[PDB]
Design a binder for this molecule. Structure first.
Ligand SMILES: O=C(O)[C@@]12CCN[C@@H](CN1)[C@H]2CCC[B-](O)(O)O
Ligand SMILES: O=C(O)[C@@]12CCN[C@@H](CN1)[C@H]2CCC[B-](O)(O)O
Ligand SMILES: O=C(O)[C@@]12CCN[C@@H](CN1)[C@H]2CCC[B-](O)(O)O
Ligand SMILES: [Mn+2]
Ligand SMILES: [Mn+2]
Ligand SMILES: [Mn+2]
Ligand SMILES: [Mn+2]
Ligand SMILES: [Mn+2]
Ligand SMILES: [Mn+2]
Lengths: 318, 318, 318
């Protein structure tokens, strides 16, 4: 199969990056929906690297207000090694989350093989709080801070994060779908000059112009690998309700498919994160199926599935 | 009244073009919503040509996998004669469906009077499967193939389709709202070079630019009659749920109204089809009423109803 | 604090401008939602002037078909005095409605202090029916007619409105979200050449271009105070269902936030109306909460709440 359709599946059943239980069941419900089989039906070379075993760390004391540091740190350390392994074998790493703190591991691991990578962060939130700016102490709203080179010296010695080496610069990340940014996070965003397309920007320009500008900002000089970190809460709760931090007025089902269809077309998708799917937070079983089916569709569009249609290189009329 | 508001209503109670019963009740529920009365209030010259009597054909054996061949062929032959009769009487033919296989008859009948006509196909699907490329065998997903001049020789001698003569070229049809295109259908779409606006194009350009490009492509060279074949499944299941083949991430209620308002504005709407309203496939009676009201509003916008308002040619301030 | 964040809240519990009871509870439920507390958390200087006493006007027989003329007239006259008082204190007037007939008073009072003001009218309706063009006789669909200079000699001597002097020219008002315009209203809108952005224009251009054009049309020649008269029915009934006159295919939550975010950014918002919130017209208790939460979120965006985020002028990393 083609470079853009060669995949390495990594299940990441991890929840300790946030307090709401159930997000660890995210790979399980995505697998049950037949994601792996649906990718194979779409001419993909799928290798399953299995679901990562995250060992329970007893006496995991908090770093100030920051909850479960050793658990989050080790989970990302394990994921970093696994992403790097998948990348070394010439496959697009597909991380099935699990909470977004795992993006520390997913982006770090990918950067060990592809240091020149560009990040497209589709989320309602920036996840750029430092262990000092954070008000919740939930590490799922902190992964970008640990990854940015400009925030070196601003990140204190947090237990379980000694292995982390900042791999991405402020100029190498683009946000799409922002609508709930903390004051500390908004300060970082402005002072570091990070490129972002909040809901205000999406409303102003349209998803067409947003994607045009996103890809031109990262690829303009020359072709480079693309790491798409997709948080399902980036999409509106009418499409993805079964998530931990849902915010109204999000990206539509159509806009989400548009972002992913555009990234596939470049043939540069190198790393992918499908995060914050929480099957225990659906108000009805239909809300759960709706979130999962939306997340499956988002993933299928990243690896070829086009709304205009798809066809094998054969004569259907002969 | 004006040419753009002179209508000839044709009731098409037919379901044998697909296996889901209830789509034949479409004209009855559309009439019960007060469609004819609502049009007359909108300064329209409305003439009811009645509901076409489609006689049940016994021992109608399928051609390979193609279900009910004689029944579909006869229903479209009856509609072809009726549309032509309406068109000769200087009226805009309004076909109330019924499944989309009737479009063979509606377009063939319209083409007998106006051979220079252009087709605007609003649907989630292409309906361009040939009797050989089809996997389901349902003729409602096959009308474009029978009508296209480029597909002559690929269409075998299907019983009851001997009257069918290809009336339109690949260059005379524009699709709007595509999101579920079969591999065989996508092959035909690309190799014939048919102009299309799938949900990806709608998201990229916006419905404003989609309509600007659609009308410029078909009416650019010279003013030609417009045939609008509107499948209710073209619109999102949140607005048209009581339909046979619903597909997520559809055209909004607004976009649907904008397509129809822009077509009215040209003063070239010559043929209209309101297809796939199945009043027995709505989960609740509210879902049934929602589909019918959306279908009614779409039809009203085709014959003058503007969201900015409407006024009679009199002084309201006197 | 900032001029764009200095607020003077005016509770206008008035319903006699329409026949549906409960709209008088609009300032009560908006307060209960924590509007004042939320505004104060957004660095706003908030002064509460309380709910205006609308002393009963019994034996208020109709003027032709026009219902409750003296009650509407006096409620607007009293509101005008209070808006003018709030304006003289150097605060942005925030009128918590109540039905839209109160806009007669809100705009008149604001114009006494700032006669150079421009109006942004966010509604599904024009509310430009004269007491002679109105078919319902409900004064909530007549405020703009009493305010427009060009309609002088066209407004009959309605009891309770002798105090009214037209304060805005046809060229100083912009409509956003129109989809239910009466024939009499459409005649007025087109003959006076009033700038409007009906749902057709919003679909054609996108909310980005709509706001760019709206603000250029009003502030282009010279900078002047902006009066935002926001009817909650301007937004789709999927966001604001607890309202008197709901119309399908409305402005999205995102579009409403975009309009209000763009108005704040000018730093020229001087008058604001949050109208037609009716807590007694919710099909379920959730529909009531949804409307009030949408109305609160719209108001927060008018005074600084940005989706991209907000931060205090302090070093968040130190
Ligand atoms: O915990 C925090 O720092 C929060 C608190 C307020 N709401 C959000 C912004 N900052 C939340 C993060 C959500 C993480 B994620 O994008 O869902 O993965
Ligand atoms: O039967 C077929 O050929 C199908 C099968 C898969 N889903 C659709 C695309 N091709 C269906 C057509 C629906 C017809 B109509 O647009 O609803 O009128
Ligand atoms: O009463 C009238 O004149 C109406 C009648 C038909 N529907 C509307 C347009 N004209 C209604 C006004 C709604 C007022 B308001 O924007 O909700 O404040
Ligand atoms: Mn996230
Ligand atoms: Mn998030
Ligand atoms: Mn169809
Ligand atoms: Mn269809
Ligand atoms: Mn109003
Ligand atoms: Mn209104």
């Amino acid at each position: 199969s083609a470079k853009s359709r060669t995949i390495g599946i990594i299940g990441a059943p991890f929840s300790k990056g946030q307090p709401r239980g159930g997000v660890e069941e995210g790979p399980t419900v995505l697998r049950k929906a037949g994601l792996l089989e649906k990718l194979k039906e779409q001419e993909c070379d799928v290798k399953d690297y299995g679901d990562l075993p995250f060992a329970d760390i007893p006496n995991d004391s908090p770093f100030q207000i920051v909850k479960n540091p050793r658990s989050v740190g080790k989970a990302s350390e394990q994921l970093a090694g696994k992403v790097a392994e998948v990348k070394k074998n010439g496959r697009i790493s597909l991380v099935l989350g699990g909470d977004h703190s795992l993006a520390i591991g997913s982006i770090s691991g990918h950067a060990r093989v592809h240091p020149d990578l560009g990040v497209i962060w589709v989320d309602a939130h920036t996840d750029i709080n430092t262990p000092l700016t954070t008000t919740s102490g939930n590490l799922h709203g902190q992964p970008v801070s640990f990854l940015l080179k400009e925030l070196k010296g601003k990140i204190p010695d947090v237990p379980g994060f000694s292995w982390v080496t900042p791999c991405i610069s402020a100029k190498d990340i683009v946000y799409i779908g922002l609508r709930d940014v903390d004051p500390g996070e908004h300060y970082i965003l402005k002072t570091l000059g990070i490129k972002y397309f909040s809901m205000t920007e999406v409303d102003r320009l349209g998803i067409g112009k947003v994607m045009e500008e996103t890809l031109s900002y990262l690829l303009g000089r020359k072709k480079r690998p693309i790491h798409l970190s997709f948080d399902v809460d980036g999409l509106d709760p009418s499409f993805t309700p079964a998530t931990g931090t849902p915010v109204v007025g999000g990206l539509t089902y159509r806009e989400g498919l548009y972002i992913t269809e555009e990234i596939y077309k470049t043939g540069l998708l190198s790393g992918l994160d499908i995060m914050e799917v929480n099957p225990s937070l659906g108000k009805t079983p239909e809300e759960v199926t709706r979130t999962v089916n939306t997340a499956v569709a988002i993933t299928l569009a990243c690896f070829g599935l086009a709304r205009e249609g798809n066809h094998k290189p054969i004569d259907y009329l002969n």
